[PDB]
Every structure is written in C-alpha cells, then in structure tokens.
Design a protein around this ligand. Sequence first.
Ligand SMILES: *[C@@H]1O[C@H](CO[C@H]2O[C@@H](C)[C@@H](O)[C@@H](O)[C@@H]2O)[C@@H](O[C@@H]2O[C@H](CO)[C@@H](O)[C@H](O)[C@H]2NC(C)=O)[C@H](O)[C@H]1NC(C)=O
Ligand SMILES: *[C@@H]1O[C@H](CO[C@H]2O[C@@H](C)[C@@H](O)[C@@H](O)[C@@H]2O)[C@@H](O[C@@H]2O[C@H](CO)[C@@H](O)[C@H](O)[C@H]2NC(C)=O)[C@H](O)[C@H]1NC(C)=O
Ligand SMILES: *[C@@H]1O[C@H](CO[C@H]2O[C@@H](C)[C@@H](O)[C@@H](O)[C@@H]2O)[C@@H](O)[C@H](O)[C@H]1NC(C)=O
Ligand SMILES: *[C@@H]1O[C@H](CO)[C@@H](O)[C@H](O)[C@H]1NC(C)=O
Ligand SMILES: *[C@@H]1O[C@H](CO)[C@@H](O)[C@H](O)[C@H]1NC(C)=O
Ligand SMILES: *[C@@H]1O[C@H](CO)[C@@H](O)[C@H](O)[C@H]1NC(C)=O
Ligand SMILES: [Cl-]
Ligand SMILES: [Cl-]
Ligand code: NA
Length: 527
Amino acid sequence: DIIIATKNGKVRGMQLTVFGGTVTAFLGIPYAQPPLGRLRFKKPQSLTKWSDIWNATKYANSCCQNIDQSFPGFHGSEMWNPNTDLSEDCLYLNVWIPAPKPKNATVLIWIYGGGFQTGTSSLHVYDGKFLARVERVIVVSMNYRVGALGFLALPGNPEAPGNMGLFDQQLALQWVQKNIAAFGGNPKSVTLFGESAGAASVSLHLLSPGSHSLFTRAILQSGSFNAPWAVTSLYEARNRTLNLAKLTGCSRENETEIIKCLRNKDPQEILLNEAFVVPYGTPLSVNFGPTVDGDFLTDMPDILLELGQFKKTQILVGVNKDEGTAFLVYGAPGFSKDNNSIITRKEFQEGLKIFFPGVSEFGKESILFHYTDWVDDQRPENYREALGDVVGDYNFICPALEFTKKFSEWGNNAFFYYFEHRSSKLPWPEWMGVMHGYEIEFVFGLPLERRDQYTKAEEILSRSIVKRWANFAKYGNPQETQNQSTSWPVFKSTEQKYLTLNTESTRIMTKLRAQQCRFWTSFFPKV
Ligand SMILES: *[C@@H]1O[C@H](CO[C@H]2O[C@@H](C)[C@@H](O)[C@@H](O)[C@@H]2O)[C@@H](O[C@@H]2O[C@H](CO)[C@@H](O)[C@H](O)[C@H]2NC(C)=O)[C@H](O)[C@H]1NC(C)=O
Ligand SMILES: *[C@@H]1O[C@H](CO[C@H]2O[C@@H](C)[C@@H](O)[C@@H](O)[C@@H]2O)[C@@H](O[C@@H]2O[C@H](CO)[C@@H](O)[C@H](O)[C@H]2NC(C)=O)[C@H](O)[C@H]1NC(C)=O
Ligand SMILES: *[C@@H]1O[C@H](CO[C@H]2O[C@@H](C)[C@@H](O)[C@@H](O)[C@@H]2O)[C@@H](O)[C@H](O)[C@H]1NC(C)=O
Ligand SMILES: *[C@@H]1O[C@H](CO)[C@@H](O)[C@H](O)[C@H]1NC(C)=O
Ligand SMILES: *[C@@H]1O[C@H](CO)[C@@H](O)[C@H](O)[C@H]1NC(C)=O
Ligand SMILES: *[C@@H]1O[C@H](CO)[C@@H](O)[C@H](O)[C@H]1NC(C)=O
Ligand SMILES: [Cl-]
Ligand SMILES: [Cl-]
Ligand code: NA
C-alpha cells in the first residue's frame, strides 16, 4: 500500500506493472475548489483540505466540451474525444512516479491541446507511465477548463476575466511546487511540455510573471502563442461574449448581470451555442481562447516576445511535416479521408475561402500565387499538397520557427526539431502524411510497448526521442549521448539549424521552409 501525505491531505496511489518493472500512479488528485455555481467563469480557488485518505486510483472527470462527431466509429478522430465523464467538476491532476520511489527526480508536466476548446489529461496517448518507468522521471498532467467555461472574457471584470483555463494550469504548477517533494520530485527541476493549444499554453507561461518561478524549462510541440489561432483580441473576445449572451437569451445592460445569467444556464446550453458566437468559423476556430487580461497576460504577447520580456531558460520547439492535413477533411471541398482527394484549382480557391474567411480577395490571390507555382510535372496532387502546406505553414510551422528565432535572440539555448515519421499504425489515409498530433505517442513512449504492434524502427525512434526529451528536462540539452547519435545543435538566428526525427537517418539541416515563412511572417500580416 502507498499513501503520500500532501499539504492538503493524504492520497492513495496504485501500482502498475510496466516492462517488468513498476510505476506508482496517482490518477485524479484534486487541485482546486470545483468551479461550480458561483465560481463558474472565475479564477480557480484554493483547496479546502481533507482528513482521511483520498483515493487517486482512477482518472477523474474531463471538463465540459463539445465532441468531434464528424466520424463516428473512426479511431483517427475518436481517439481525441474524452474518455471520462464530462463535468464542470474537472480540476484534477495525475502523478506517475517510478518505483522504487525516487529521491529527487526531474519533473515533466504535460499540458494537452485541443484548440483551447477540447481535451483531457486521461487520453491513452498522454499516459505517463512509460516515461516514469524508462527514464525515472515523474510525470504530472492536469485538466484545465476549455471553451467558454475556460476563456469567456469580459475584460477587467472578475466575474469573467478570461484566461481561467490558464490559471487552472498555473494553479496545478503551484500544487507541484508545494507538493511534489513528498512524491520524490525536484520542484527545482520542472519542465513543461505540451502540444498545439498545450504548446501555446507552454509559451504563455514563459511570458507570465505569475508562472516565472513554477518551472525550469519548456518544450513546445506544434504550437506557440504567436500562432494566428492562439490569442483572441479584446475586440473579438467581447463580440463573442455578447453573441453568446444574446444566443442564450442573457443579453443585459449591466455586464455583471450578463454573467449572473450565464451562470444559470446549464452546461449543455453554453456548449451548444459556442460554435455560433462567430459568423464565419474555420476548421481551426478557437472561439474562446487566451486574452490579454492585464493579469495572466500583461500586454500583447507579440510585444513581450519582441522586446525580450519572458523567462530566460532553454526551449525545445518542433513541428511535424504535414501539420495542415488533419484540418482539410473538416470542411475543405473535395477532401475526404476515404479517397485520395485530388482536388482542382477551383477547389483550392474555395479551400482558401474556408480557411481564410476574410481576408481580402488580394490576400487570397497572394497565397495562391506563392503556393501554386508548379515545378512542375502536373502532378494531379499539386493543389491537394499545396492546400495542406498553406494550412500547416501559416498555422503552425512558421509561427513556431518565428518564436524560436525571436526567443533565441535574447541569448538562450534553443533546439528545434522537424518530425517526419508517419506512424505504421496511423488510421488516417496516406495522403495526409505525418499528421498534426501524431508525434505525441512517440514522446510518451507508446512504441516501447512491444505488445502494441509498432515496427522495430519505431520502437528505436521512440526510445531515442524519450531519451532526448528526458535529457532536455534534467540537463537542458536534448542529446542522446550513448549510441553514436547525431548531435542536436542549438538553433541560432543566422544559421537556423534543426534536427530531423525519422526512422532512417536523422540529419542536421538549416532554414526550414525559408521561402514560405518569409511570405507568412513578413508579407501576409500586412494584407
Ligand atoms: C460581431 O458580432 C456580430 C453579431 O452577429 C451575430 O449574432 C450572433 C448572435 C451570432 O448568431 C452570429 O452568427 C451573428 O453573425 C456580427 O454581425 C454579423 O455580420 C454578418 C455579416 O458580416 C451579418 O450578415 C450578420 O447577420 C451580422 N449580425 C448582426 C446582428 O449584425 C459581426 O460580424 C461580428 N464581428 C466579427 C466578425 O468579429
Ligand atoms: C473524394 O470524396 C469527396 C468527399 O465527399 C464524398 O465522399 C465520397 C467517398 C463519396 O462516397 C460521396 O458520397 C461523398 O459526397 C468527393 O467530394 C464530393 O464530390 C461530389 C461529386 O459529386 C460532390 O457532389 C460533393 O459535394 C463532394 N463532397 C463534399 C461535400 O465536399 C470527391 O469528389 C472524392 N474525390 C475523389 C474520389 O478523388
Ligand atoms: C534536489 O536537488 C536540488 C537542485 O537540483 C537542481 O538544480 C536546479 C538549479 C536545476 O538546474 C535542476 O535541473 C537541478 O537538478 C537541491 O538544491 C535540493 O536541495 C535537492 N533536494 C533533495 C536531494 O531532496
Ligand atoms: C479507497 O479505496 C480502497 C480500496 O482498497 C479502500 O480500502 C478504501 O475504503 C477506499 N475509500 C473509499 C471507497 O472512499
Ligand atoms: C451593476 O450591477 C452590479 C451587481 O449588483 C452592481 O454591483 C453594480 O454596481 C452595477 N453597476 C452600475 C452602477 O451600473
Ligand atoms: C542504445 O542502443 C541499444 C542497441 O544497440 C539499445 O538496446 C538501447 O536501448 C539504446 N539506448 C538508447 C537510450 O537509445
Ligand atoms: Cl483564376
Ligand atoms: Cl542517429
Ligand atoms: Na505580395
């Protein structure tokens, strides 16, 4: 039996057999007062404290969220849907530790993505027992409110200040600060890691004064706060708060009245209207996201970044080779997971209308002009390939590279990867390539599990990634030093070296998507 005593009371874990060894798991530890009733839309509150033993033996409630019903029965989508009850009472976290209990272990904390609208810590691809077994790190992960319940904003008004999900994440990091020593962890060696909205959250904690001292280093997988989807302008954030009041018959005149009303709606009514607070949605819509709230975020983050106002530490940042493909099947014309999706020029342009709602006509000719200069053959898959690249370069790859450049210029070591392995088990079709989100299972070590049907080359790839992630966290340097591996060079402005992660040869290259990001980063924001 394994009981640990925490500042707020005792908690009982659960032993797990992993690869002939053992990990202890504490699944479902509360970290804040449940945000119900009068606390809906408010910053998370401190935990009352309990006598008697809290059992942390199963995942807890996922936070309320809309579900992907686009492909019922389909593992490719359904693997991202919550696998525990939805409930507004979802502020819990998980701790996997190695056995025997470690003495002063480096801690990894995962922050999931999901567009800030969806996600949960209990997905099978975020299961931290492989890491803890194999690398003897402690892994922590938390649920944080998403959608309007998480990011609804009415600026300056503490009934609904915005950024509540980010305060959820932040209060989980405090919990780790106060508590992880008792589990054998080193509060002085904490690395945050996250993918997509989770990565963007990691980068905002790098800008938040309140987070400065709740962690050591950071890993950003396919996301960063300067991505076009990542921060809602104060303008939009109120237009949206109002369209939601309106939509739920909660329009008022006193704004604290609007919120009192919204607190009486029942969660389904809020979720149901979220998709409509925007007149034109894209498959990449983030209707309720982070804002400049004057609290968590003190200024537009583009400015903090440019002027070097952020935590000085090392970062590991990377992207997948076909970031944009996943989204094309959620609304782009002539695209389907059940066929090769050869599209025509006319469909390409309609595609751009879907992804770039408005966006002038010249805006969209300029994208087409940059991306449809065929070299050449013809090449029926030209327009299909080009639309995915447009979507991936704009939304993920260029914002990641730009973030890494800028961050690196204030003098910190920074490492950049380019993930280009397609999982042998991937359920989406071949033309979608190395999709967004499909490096996560390599990082968490799922292919280390031989019973699971991955190739040999996959097990090895994952073994090396896990090592590089762990070395980054413990040492600030993502080398794999033993098996004559390629040395991962720091990313400097000027040379802009990066490391490729694939099953055959990993290599050092320079200047990923140089022409494309010059277009995205320098020219496009003007239009
Ligand atoms: C800011 O909000 C207004 C609000 O309009 C919205 O009403 C909501 C309840 C919601 O159902 C939503 O679908 C609806 O659009 C937006 O104004 C709208 O703009 C379009 C044309 O651009 C009109 O044809 C709509 O009918 C119009 N509605 C009203 C009542 O004016 C507005 O566009 C939006 N601004 C943005 C894009 O941020
Ligand atoms: C690949 O499929 C797309 C997607 O939509 C289709 O799914 C198919 C597998 C098919 O069974 C069909 O029932 C379904 O509509 C096809 O695009 C569609 O093309 C048809 C042609 O008449 C249009 O009318 C549809 O509007 C359009 N679908 C939408 C809503 O986007 C596509 O043609 C097909 N392409 C191939 C085989 O290369
Ligand atoms: C546990 O180790 C503590 C310090 O180790 C960390 O130093 C940090 C600055 C950071 O770079 C981490 O990556 C290092 O691992 C030490 O001061 C504590 O007193 C130790 N406590 C124990 C052994 O219980
Ligand atoms: C916690 O679970 C254990 C299972 O062995 C049990 O001994 C204890 O009574 C539990 N407390 C409950 C059910 O709240
Ligand atoms: C709006 O109503 C709230 C809630 O009772 C109240 O605190 C506030 O003073 C009101 N604002 C004004 C004066 O318009
Ligand atoms: C080193 O390579 C060997 C195979 O020769 C393998 O058994 C081992 O797991 C590797 N270590 C790492 C950290 O990749
Ligand atoms: Cl034309
Ligand atoms: Cl190698
Ligand atoms: Na131009």
